Design a protein around this ligand. Sequence first.
Ligand code: HEM
Ligand SMILES: [Cl-]
Length: 367
Amino acid sequence: MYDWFKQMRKESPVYYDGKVWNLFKYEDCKMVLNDHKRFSSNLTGYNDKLEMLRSGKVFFDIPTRYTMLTSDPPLHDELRNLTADAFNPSNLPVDFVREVTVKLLSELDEEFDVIESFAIPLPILVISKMLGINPDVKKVKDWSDLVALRLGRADEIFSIGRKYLELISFSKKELDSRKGKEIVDLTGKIANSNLSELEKEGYFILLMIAGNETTTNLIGNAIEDFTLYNSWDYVREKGALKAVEEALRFSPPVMRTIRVTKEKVKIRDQVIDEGELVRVWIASANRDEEVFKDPDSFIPDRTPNPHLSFGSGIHLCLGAPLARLEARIALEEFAKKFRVKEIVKKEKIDNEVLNGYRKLVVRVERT
Ligand code: HEM
Ligand SMILES: [Cl-]
């Protein structure tokens, strides 16, 4: 995928495939992501039916159509601000994370799968913690793949199956709980808000899932990258702050984004009429020669590192501060306790916009 980008970065930054536009240039990308006035995120008719929905009307539709993720201002501000200050560094359960993470490694054997044994649990253990719920890790993971693994796939991203209704009823049940208030759970806040009934169900599923899957991929990626390019030592003594950041740029969980135009736009020599999709490639951007010196090299201490892994602008991953945190503690405790001796085998997540491993086996020996 990267050779293509490098090529597209040179030959054609603003490319039009069959029906969607594509940007591979950092500059073009960043600008577009910060231009919510023209490049909108209203891709599910969320804003459109905000009046109809708030009027109390109720129609059947997958709750995932209505998340702040696909909403434009000012509705966005309204949805994001409700639980935005909960994900600020100061309000992060840094303790919980460290304790659940340390336990997570308490008995790791000589050859285990870091994904299904560490990468998957932590995210879900934590987001649910903040979420104020606590179900089956396998259950949540199932619901996550169900939602994520259908990303990018043109229509199977709005379709409802049986196991999906299980996700819907789950949210409805959990939600119904928290009302009566005395808020404590992030879920708590959600239920008791002016939001329409299904908006609540969308916001709920949005934090539970958008949390873990991408967060797990980041740690799986980091572990490989840190091994392939030998960065473990550096981690043990200097920390994981800058490294965690290199992982993001070099091996991003979210390979790209998409947006629609509200007016005619002209990015470079290419004009784009309104009502068109614009695939914003974060991965390509992260490797742009114009912005990163020796971009195709992995540098744990690489700085500056203005990657677009978490996005940019007003939709900048709301869980960004939490992920870096979870990322840092998992890798340092892992780096502290273990010493990777080799990457035995690995299976990639079958998805084109989610860069990650579903299984990553490693041989190790305790310090
Ligand atoms: C761990 C690696 C993670 C990555 C790489 C990542 C990446 C991204 C990206 C690229 C976007 C772009 C949204 C848009 O501009 O199109 C986004 C949005 C969002 N992310 Fe993440 N994310 C991660 C973890 C998390 C976590 C852990 C949570 C919550 C626990 C979370 C919550 C959100 C939310 C709510 C949004 C939507 C923000 C809004 O629209 O204002 N993310 N994320
Ligand atoms: Cl089904």
